Symmetry: D2
Subunit: 225 residues, 4 copies
């Protein structure tokens, strides 16, 4: 019950985006253990579906509160709760397309639920690219580098991502993020890693395009002594 | 009329955007001579003013119809009128900031007016960068290379841009644009260059943030025989 | 003489390099008119032949003296003669390959001959890429932007290059060059453009791998009034 | 005594490089446990010293044989011994400078020593940059991503590196590597991580510029279950 978070919370998701001119809105709700960096997100496309681009590109847009932080690493994110935090991210794929996303994370103590406001925009996905051809299956597990920006008291994210393709090829992407606490940080953490594992399961049917995302993230430092 | 265009038209502008969470809306109008690739733009911030980021980053979002093309190069843009055309672009600044914008151009023949609709999103402008410190003054005259992608009957733009700084420095940006006619083109151009000159003059008062833009662009091939 | 240069000179070339472990040495000569930015280059592989990678990637390594400059723009290069100048450049291809090259240009007044010495190193050209499959044909005419760095009295080059492919495709590369006079310049130019046209004609026989290059370059400012 | 490697070997180092025109040669010899991914390298600049650029940029040029591979991960490197392997790497620093390095690793069973042939080239380090001003202290610990290239049976390396600066700033760099076994690989490993820790200790004096590098590297997979 620290900072407004419990070992078993819920979340509500709302995302509005536009990719190469195609507008869309996504409604969702999930649950997870902010302390074990584990969450189950359930999303449904209410507007724009069926999406003309691969839904995998949106995955990383839907919450560092769900990160397991050991005692040795300051937890900037939970530290700024229940107020929440905001982040801004961009990424260019190896084929020129670039996307940017922003989200506002707010914790509602009364409901023991987290409210996620998501924004996503992308441009220039090649017509014959794996994204427009829906040939992606999952983001390969990664190791994100979290750097502290002292002067301004915020964090920077740097992670090389690979979107695995059905044809076995790898689609490289560079995540560059800025994490801002909605509350003046009293203590800034040192640099550290955050390994992630994000999986997508298509739950689509004749009526709706929907899917589930399971994210497992955990912080740490150099494995080397 | 020749594609519904004349040498003395007016324009209507409406942009909606968000840079690092700060929403804003801009409206404006103007006049120009498409045949001489010359245009005057008058903008006013009707929402989100005063903008916390330099207005210079938005400048290249406000119409290739205003490009003087020589008869030796196919004018993909004027050929798409009056229906018009759409475009998508990414801005990758040297300090990590990245922006993406899209627009829809349409010609209203009866009104001899061109309607311009756009969206602009940017992310990660450093707090002490030239953009947030409002040190930018104007984009530097450039030379964009236009490449044809015949398989999709669309065009690709490539131009390394430089924003001049008040201290005498410069700030680099990379423009990667995809241009696409609304109606299928029955003829495609070979690659070519487009030189531009874009100038901004701020005319903000106590009641509103406003400014004018002046663009001049000409299409050409290599200068070497 | 005007800086020891004349309108009908000869040149001497010697390049040493290594691309992905494959060493090679190239020698050659030529003639040209610096005042009209026009030159003819004859190269021959004397070591490492036949080159396993397309000879096109080396082409831009073989002299800004051959740039026709208008009196309205300071000719930083001719002003550095006869001592000459040195330059350093990086090539970042779209498939991950990166090359770096440097050269030292010197004018031998008595011999009316320019001595050109260079080194060229490249790395990671994919086995099935256009370079190793020898699919390249010629660089496309370009427009390089020259920027002055007054604090070090040196110049910076910026040009997005495209190598044309035999199947009708293109292969992008990014030229980032630093140019520096050997003797301190007593005058610096403003930024400007330099348009180029470089053509290769292979003339290899049973005994040697040889080819000729023809370059034409002119300096200018914006085409817009 | 597997593949020619023991739990306690030695190495000899020879590197020839050129940075922005400055030539240099480095002679060295080290020892380590290829099985615990631990090594102590001792280098001395015999030519070109004192180096005008920060010696930290050369660090990663001096042997994946020194990586601890658990039973669950195939060991491509030791697998190709005692023949050895070769690698090619490039990296662009956030300020434009780019370097490329290559090395040939050969194991000498009789001497129980590894011979390291190193090549390094860099260009365009800003005069007032942290590299030319010698303001760097160490490469921050990292997590490299090792990907297998099936078709060709080789490995690709991807690691975002940060060269820590005396003034506390971080100097970003992107390592892109290709690892090639000098012997047809019979078994290719799946993707995996290789965390590293490389430290530099200046052992320079009035006669020689010399220093020691301790590298500790260990392979693994997603920390997440």
């Amino acid at each position: 019950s620290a900072h407004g978070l419990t070992d078993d919370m819920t979340m509500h998701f709302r995302m509005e985006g536009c990719v190469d001119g195609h507008k869309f809105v996504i409604e969702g709700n999930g649950n997870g253990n902010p302390f074990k960096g584990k969450q189950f997100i359930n999303l449904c496309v209410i507007e724009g579906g069926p999406l003309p681009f691969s839904e995998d590109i949106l995955s990383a847009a839907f919450n560092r509160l769900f990160t397991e932080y050991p005692e040795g690493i300051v937890d900037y994110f939970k530290n700024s709760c229940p107020a929440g935090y905001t982040w801004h991210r961009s990424f260019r794929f190896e084929d020129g397309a670039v996307c940017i996303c922003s989200a506002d994370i707010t914790v509602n103590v009364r409901e023991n639920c987290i409210y996620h406001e998501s924004t996503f925009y992308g441009v220039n996905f090649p017509a014959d690219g794996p994204v427009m051809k829906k040939m992606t299956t999952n983001w390969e597990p990664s190791c994100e580098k979290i750097i502290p920006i002292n002067s301004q008291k915020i964090l920077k994210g740097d992670v090389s991502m690979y979107l695995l393709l059905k044809d076995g090829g790898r689609y490289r992407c560079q995540f560059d993020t800025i994490y801002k606490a909605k509350t003046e940080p009293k203590e800034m953490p040192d640099w550290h890693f955050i390994q992630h594992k994000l999986n997508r399961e298509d739950r689509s049917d004749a009526k709706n395009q929907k899917w589930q995302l399971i994210e497992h993230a955990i912080a740490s430092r150099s494995a080397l002594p």
